[model samples]
Target: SPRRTPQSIPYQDLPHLVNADGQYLFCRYWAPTGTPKALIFVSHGAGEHSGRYEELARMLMGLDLLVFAHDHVGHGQSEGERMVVSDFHVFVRDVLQHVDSMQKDYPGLPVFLLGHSMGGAIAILTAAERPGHFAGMVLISPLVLATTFKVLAAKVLNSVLPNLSSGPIDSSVLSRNKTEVDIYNSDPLICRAGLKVCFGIQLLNAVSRVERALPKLTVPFLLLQGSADRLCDSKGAYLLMELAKSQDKTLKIYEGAYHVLHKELPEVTNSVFHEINMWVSQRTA
Candidate 1:
């Protein structure tokens, strides 16, 4: 069975903080009763929403963790040119602001972040920028670099057509499992044209920034990637673990799994959840 329904916490959709573009930002909070062991902030990948993380949130909540997440300016129900960004820095700024807001609510609680794909890249950048903000981080299949030259060619195409809708991109690149692709395509809640030309540029830029700053990220981190993921190079995760300044960093590579490990392999997913829970528990204790 999947997780329970998420209890929505009220939030404000504010104007862009970094630019004068007038784009609106979206965010949400999810807290269960009593004191939360720790507060977790999540950022989703390019084409998904905060709601897609309900299952992960439920698992965290069961472990006594309060969760907070936001759809980027262009993704989810957030207001903007869905899956497109005019400035990549705005995404990083929004994450900082959201962290500040989360801290205000759960004062004294150890804060952590979990970002996947594009969001994972953002999480690493954010941690590099504000090393003290998080007690730890969980990065899932982060897109440090494309797995192949063909993927790089796709990024070049994005540079030329940043606003092009996500209609033509092969769906096979999205997931390794056919069932997962079918469900994603048919799901009414899922955003179909989640990729834009500008999005590709921003993603590459973010990856570059994170790679440069990884040597400075001394915070404890959990890097999870699948051996079979096509979106991100599995070798990159290994390299990160090898170079990370953090003395307490771990990298787990799941054999034969795809990009979305949380959904692809049930046993591995559950094991990762348990490992993360225990890690967070040790830190907050």
Candidate 2:
């Protein structure tokens, strides 16, 4: 996506799970050294693989929580065409089945699901369909509203060719930290690569479903957003904060922060993570 060389930390040697479509999905699992207090499933953003969450997963594991994440079918180490899915719900369903398996694997422990960006939208839709299955969700810089120009471009492209690849997104707009932006720009694995037009249609359809499901979305959840995000707009986060009927709903907005709030300076990211840890602990306790 970003102009890059192929460089990334070697992926974790985790087991693979076959989805309903019979596609092999590579997943990372972090077994807490001590008995785990809870289990967290982290669904990464689109174009980004699950391994990109090494920092988040390690932090959760250090908190004595079992951590797991899987590359979406078309992204990361999973078996699918890169950055393409005929139906976005395919991503949603796969994560739900993974939840079912985790419940069976570690009985009686509270399970939490956290998703970022596109994964944030995926997390919301997934928790909606099976509200009782997950304890809660954390949505950071979700893909609620695509830009007006991007929408126009998608429509024009879908009209003529719905299955072709699009171009790279500017990585410099993602965060305030230059080092973080540089790393992403250099990482060969980042997808911000060209997107498929038909898949664009599928993403719009999926996000539409997410918007429709909000009033009926009863799961307890948190909305974390940035005031300065160049990608997902901040108002979308505020809209969800108002629309959700969850009794324990929470919304936190960082002043002038970029899209990847978790990858920002320690003060910003640490606080976000701390809030999540606190919310889940209170609910499970």
Candidate 3:
């Protein structure tokens, strides 16, 4: 099978699926040729959009995985107040609804959910809420918990000023590594100063939910965390491994990797994908 680029893959911009508070939620579908073994639904973090996962989607497609991703209500090309939301549950609902739609498109194929950061938390909560919704989940540096007071302070600010959406706030607490900051800034697709107080609250709430539900998550899970992640503590990853009820859960902590493990280190990223590919291969076998 030949590799497909962003231009080669068939893409459709689904607009206004339903009316949510006078806003139309949107999603993008990427389907390549060949029998898709599974449907992978991807969600972005707080300030980013689905397009940020283009590289990862192309990689998964090479392995015969059908990829579907959507911009959260207030993020990406989706219609909504950018980086503003009253309840973060809407983001989780968007993911679940989109996954349901994908299942309808590709019946009998294993369904896997992959979320990064805020999206990772959404994936975990969605899986926990409906165990049968997905066969497995991949959480990359999930915001399950934060370690420092600065991180906690951001969460508090969001709760206090949920709708105070000024420009992106400079939060030194996001990550300690300068490379992480530079890459984020340089990425053409990434949103600068798009982080909002309401978005932060939603993330914190999702993390709290994950804490209570971790022990009950019996579904197979793969948690990839960075040893040097300043955003989400590596200790939290270990906690998930220790507490998850899933007998097949595994945690891989990459040393010297940053919060954006996928983009930070290519070697680590490739290894992570290889591991996931093996897991998917074995699961469908």
Ten contiguous residues minimizing lDDT sum, candidate 2: 1-10
Model 2 ranges with Cα > 4 A deviation: 1-14, 146-160
Maximum-lDDT candidate: 2
Residue-by-residue lDDT tens digits, candidate 1, 124-145: 8888888766799989888677
lDDT of each: 0.74, 0.81, 0.73
Q: Superposing all C-alpha atoms, what RMSD in Å does each candidate have to the true structure?
A: 5.8, 4.4, 6.1
Predicted structure 3: lDDT = 0.73
Q: Write the per-residue lDDT of candidate 2 for residues 1-285, one digit (tens) a residue.
A: 221112332333437788998787877898888688888899998778887788878877877888988889887767777788868999999998888898898899888888988898898888888866677887888877656787778778788877777665668778888888888877666766676887877878877888997887778888889998887889889888878888778889999899999888678889988987777667655
TM-score per candidate? 0.83, 0.89, 0.82
- For candidate 1, give the lDDT: 0.74
Give the higher-lDDT candidate: 1 or 3. Answer: 1
- Clashing pairs in model 3? none
lDDT by residue for model 3 (1-285), tens: 422222232224343344345455556666779788888888788777787787777877777888888777766656666677678778777777777777887889888888888888888888888975578888888878834774667767765665655456343434445665676677644556655656666666788898998988988888888898776788888988988889888888888787776666568868877877777677765
Candidate 1 segments whose C-alpha is farther than 4 A from its true place:
1-22, 146-161, 165-170, 173-179
Which of 2 and 3 is ahead in lDDT?
2
